[PDB]
Amino acid sequence: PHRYRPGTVALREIRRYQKSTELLIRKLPFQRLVREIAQDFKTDLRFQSSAVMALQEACEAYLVGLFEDTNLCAIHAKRVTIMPKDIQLARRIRGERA
Amino acid sequence: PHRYRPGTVALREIRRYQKSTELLIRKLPFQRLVREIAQDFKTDLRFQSSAVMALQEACEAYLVGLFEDTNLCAIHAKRVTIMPKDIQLARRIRGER
Amino acid sequence: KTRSSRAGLQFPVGRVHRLLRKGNYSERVGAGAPVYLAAVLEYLTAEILELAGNAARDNKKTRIIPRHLQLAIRNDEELNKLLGRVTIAQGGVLPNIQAVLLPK
Amino acid sequence: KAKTRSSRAGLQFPVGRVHRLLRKGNYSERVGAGAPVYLAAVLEYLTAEILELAGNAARDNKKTRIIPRHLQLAIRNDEELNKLLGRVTIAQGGVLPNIQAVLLPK
Amino acid sequence: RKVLRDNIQGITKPAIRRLARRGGVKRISGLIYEETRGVLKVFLENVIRDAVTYTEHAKRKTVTAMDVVYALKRQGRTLYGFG
Amino acid sequence: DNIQGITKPAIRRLARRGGVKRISGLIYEETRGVLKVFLENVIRDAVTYTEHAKRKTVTAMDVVYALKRQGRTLYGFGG
Amino acid sequence: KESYSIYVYKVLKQVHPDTGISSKAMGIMNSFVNDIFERIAGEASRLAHYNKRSTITSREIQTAVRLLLPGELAKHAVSEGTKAVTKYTSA
Amino acid sequence: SRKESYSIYVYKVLKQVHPDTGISSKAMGIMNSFVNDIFERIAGEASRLAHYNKRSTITSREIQTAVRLLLPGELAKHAVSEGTKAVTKYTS
DNA sequence: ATCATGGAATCATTGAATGGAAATGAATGGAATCATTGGTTGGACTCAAATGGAATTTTCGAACAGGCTCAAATGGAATCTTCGAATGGATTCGAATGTAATCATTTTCGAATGGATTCGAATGGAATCTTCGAATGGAAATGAT
DNA sequence: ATCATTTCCATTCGAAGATTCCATTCGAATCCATTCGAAAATGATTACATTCGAATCCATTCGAAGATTCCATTTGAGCCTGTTCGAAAATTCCATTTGAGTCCAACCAATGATTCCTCTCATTTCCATTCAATGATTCCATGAT
Structure with missing residues (x-):
């Protein structure tokens, strides 16, 4: 039997997803999530498909940015594992919070 | 002889300066620094005294903010001492760097 | 009668109309717009003045100073976020010490 | 006779239209005849710089056609465009391949 | 209609993982995924509120890509490509 | 050597108003860099405003416009 | 030559009738009104244009x-x- | 009813700089977004300059x-x- | 060190999709002519910003003592990565619905404008008062037993 | 928890000065009336978003082995902080100089408005060529031995 060591497929995935630009969240889940949120704001709305595509581009771009900063926070704490305390520190210094 | 333990006069300095609003840099040096810096852009200029006050207000407000975030970074690293590495992380996350 | 009176405002509906016309925001300004705007301005001035005043007499003082405005702004959530990117000259900070720096 | 102001300024970008958008966009009641010339110049210049660096990255990806990934590589590897677009998102740009040193194996 | 509820769970753990990898993340604690779902949820709310505000102002019932683009610029997260 | 006029005690006072219990020794120069960069970026912008008004005096309003542009809006000096 | 001081003071008297304002605190209040004015007016201008x-x-x-x-x-x-x-309309 | 973009000009400048390279529809939309963005930033800041003065x-x-x-x-x-x-x- | 595994980067292959072209439509920028005034220029003037040099109040500092934080190194607990694959979920596609958006020509209102006047808000200058700065002991930490 | 020098905090007083209350004024908002367009509206007409189920593809997740990262701990250095103490230099004061910045007024120069039209640029179908989807392909970094 052959088994990669923990961290190997991770590094290879970093290389794989940093080389690509395709959207990383599947499309239908993200669309339903958009309709749920917007419905809780106003009822009886529809969406141009390009509006959900804008939303999803903006979102993945925001989250990937945030994981960059989260990861700098783990490493600052001498860790390799991103934790919620890392994310929360990123968002507090970004001034999105607290 | 009696001497406070290390860290107490610090905590009390924190209490004293968070309780007050005065500018903390003495003013003449800061005016000198401002005029020098401005010279390198246009020669030779003058200043409304209120302009130097505006700059100094903005400078100190920025620095206190930056020490807030720096200190959260130190604490995040399980330290009580702010290090340049902390300032650099604060500034990189703020997107100043 | 000034439009401020017919709207019940301390803030100047006429002047706000002139700044709107004269500020390059659009070719033409309806007469409802300076009314509703000057309303919002007087309102927010008032909310800040209330919370600031409160802090001014719980700090044992007669006259609102920037420190009191700063206490008001930062201890209120929605004013704080509205003025998130603003610096109050002579505001100070509001006292906060990280627990882990405390003794014992 | 009839010759356009873009020609009289030596420009690829349309000085007339930049002048109409200036008048029609509520920046001021009046637009000097010099302001749209100089603006259309700065816009054409920055378009040229971006396309320059994007074309370069498209030619190291061995492809004929600039795609958003290429604009994104151009922006983020150039220091000053990067800052100009610090707060901007290129749809379908991706990120710059960068792995923190300490995550590499030993 | 049908009832929309719990859709943030549709953003699965593997997709949060892919987003973490494009962002340079080697190892993800198990409490990250729900925290990510939290932050995403706030992000979309703050964008979508403003977009809907532009659409309501246009007396429209269809949210347009321009409404999203205006909201994002307004929010400080300017987007190119729908413009 | 005017950046040295911003002394160590003044940097430490600012750090205390910021809630800082203990200051490493390399902080002081590092702060001195950051302060200087701050002053550069604002004062450059302020001076540009002065140059455009064809003035020789940098005015508090020039400073305020610069700060607003830099994302550091200041209340109390005329805007 | 213009300020919002008379109105800020009027409203202050309305809300907290026996407290005053420092000069510089009044400067804060004037700056605040002008900032919020400009944010509202600006965004409204954009909304007009977009539509x-x-x-x-x-x-x-x-x-x-x-x-x-x-x-x-x-x-x-x-x-x-x-x-x-x-x-305002009915009056 | 009809719309405007900068595509003909962006494409012209592209030909000047890199004469055998092409541009995709999405890359062009990115470019249009860039020009409109910078247009708005310059025009806005200049408008502010006029008012200030x-x-x-x-x-x-x-x-x-x-x-x-x-x-x-x-x-x-x-x-x-x-x-x-x-x-x-343009003038002389 | 050697070699097997499995993922990746590389070979054109064979065609779907996407561009860069060509043809013309309709609309917009250019052209050419002006009251029209904002910009400019200038001559006179006031306000504020050094400058200066002296007292003066005050910060700053070099230098040591020893506390205590920080860092390195250490052990095991626990948590997170890798693995296979049934299958749930998504993606695809073709289509029918119907609903909202958009183009169009009808005027309902509303906001521009501009002249002439009251009234209001700016400013300055005088008092009323709050705030600040003392000196002076009491609660209160905070360090040593 | 114990009593003990610090210092913080409060207190109570006196003037220093900053608010504000008020006299004056001149500039701005109102009024009032009118031209003319931007906004509102309806109605016919797309069209593209929503929805459908069916087929097909792709991704998910459940549950477990064990790898290895996180953390708790000790422990020893090195680097902080706090006590003066001398001491420079920031401050305060005041008084001068005078250059810049302002303010009208007469004036020049350049920007609007507009009508006709021609030249450009938008959009469309048309077609050529790049991109891609897949398949086997050798290459190669990793993992077992």
Whole structure:
């Protein structure tokens, strides 16, 4: 039997997803999530498909940015594992919070 | 002889300066620094005294903010001492760097 | 009668109309717009003045100073976020010490 | 006779239209005849710089056609465009391949 | 209609993982995924509120890509490509 | 050597108003860099405003416009 | 030669009738009004433009305040603006 | 009813710089977004300059101080150059 | 060190999709002519910003003592990565619905404008008062037993 | 928890000065009336978003082995902080100089408005060529031995 060591497929995935630009969240889940949120704001709305595509581009771009900063926070704490305390520190210094 | 333990006069300095609003840099040096810096852009200029006050207000407000975030970074690293590495992380996350 | 009176405002509906016309925001300004705007301005001035005043007499003082405005702004959530990117000259900070720096 | 102001300024970008958008966009009641010339110049210049660096990255990806990934590589590897677009998102740009040193194996 | 509820769970753990990898993340604690779902949820709310505000102002019932683009610029997260 | 006029005690006072219990020794120069960069970026912008008004005096309003542009809006000096 | 001081003072007297203002605290108040004015007016101008309309009405100012003001501040301000406008028409 | 973009111009400049390279529809949309963005940043800052100075006109001098304020460093110097040269060519 | 595994980067292959072209439509920028005034220029003037040099109040500092934080190194607990694959979920596609958006020509209102006047808000200058700065002991930590 | 020098905090007084209350004024908002367009509206007409189920593809997740990262701990250095103490230099004061910035007024120069039209640029179908989807392909970094 052959088994990669923990961290190997991770590094290879970093290389794989940093080389690509395709959207990383599947499309239908993200669309339903958009309709749920917007419905809780106003009822009886529809969406141009390009509006959900804008939303999803903006979102993945925001989250990937945030994981960059989260990861700098783990490493600052001498860790390799991103934790919620890392994310929360990123968002507090970004001034999105607290 | 009696001497406070290390860290107490610090905590009390924190209490004293968070309780007050005065500018903390003495003013003449800061005016000198401002005029020098401005010279390198246009020669030779003058200043409304209120302009130097505006700059100094903005400078100190920025620095206190930056020490807030720096200190959260130190604490995040399980330290009580702010290090340049902390300032650099604060500034990189703020997107100043 | 000034439009401020017919709207019940301390803030100047006429002047706000002139700044709107004269500020390059659009070719033409309806007469409802300076009314509703000057309303919002007087309102927010008032909310800040209330919370600031409160802090001014719980700090044992007669006259609102920037420190009191700063206490008001930062201890209120929605004013704080509205003025998130603003610096109050002579505001100070509001006292906060990280627990882990405390003794014992 | 009839010759356009873009020609009289030596420009690829349309000085007339930049002048109409200036008048029609509520920046001021009046637009000097010099302001749209100089603006259309700065816009054409920055378009040229971006396309320059994007074309370069498209030619190291061995492809004929600039795609958003290429604009994104151009922006983020150039220091000053990067800052100009610090707060901007290129749809379908991706990120710059960068792995923190300490995550590499030993 | 049908009832929309719990859709943030549709953003699965593997997709949060892919987003973490494009962002340079080697190892993800198990409490990250729900925290990510939290932050995403706030992000979309703050964008979508403003977009809907532009659409309501246009007396429209269809949210347009321009409404999203205006909201994002307004929010400080300017987007190119729908413009 | 005017950046040295911003002394160590003044940097430490600012750090205390910021809630800082203990200051490493390399902080002081590092702060001195950051302060200087701050002053550069604002004062450059302020001076540009002065140059455009064809003035020789940098005015508090020039400073305020610069700060607003830099994302550091200041209340109390005329805007 | 202009300020908002007489109105800031009037409203202050309305809300807290026996307290005063420092000079510089009044400067804070004037700066605050001008900042918020400019944010509302600016966003309203954009809303007009986006909708291909040449005029800024109270409906623009309203959508502006909703975009610009957080939560409960938005809700109260929308009310007090709508009540100033109906009160203005019938009077 | 019809719309406008900068595609013909972006495409012209593309031909000048990199004569055998093409541009995708999405890359062009990115470019259109970039021009409209920067247009709005310059025009906005210049408008602010006129108001600040009690003037009713945006002249090429406004556009220029705008460009100095908005663009970083070497980008500013090149762009100011390219604009000043188009303007003198335009008048004289 | 040697070699097997499995993922990746590389070979054109064979065609779907996407561009860059060509043909013309309709609309917009250019052209050429002006009241029209904002910009400019200038001559006179006031306000504020050094400058200066002296007292003066005050910060700053170099230098040591020893506390205590920080860092390195250490052990095991626990948590997170890798693995296979049934299958749930998504993606695809073709289509029918119907609903909202958009183009169009009808005027309902509303906001521009501009002249002539009241009234209001700016400013300055005088008092009323709050705030600040003392000196002076009491609660209160905070360090040593 | 114990009593003990610090210092914080409060207190109570006196003037220093900053608010504000008020006299004056001149500039701005109102009024009032009118031209003319931007906004509102309806109605016919797309069209593209929503929805459908069916087929097909792709991704998910459940549950477990064990790898290895996180953390708790000790422990020893090195680097902080706190006590003066001398001491420079920031401050305060005041008084001068005078250059810049302002303010009208007469004036020049350049920007609007507009009508006709021609030249450009938008969009469309048309077609050529790049991109891609897949398949086997050798290459190669990793993992077992």
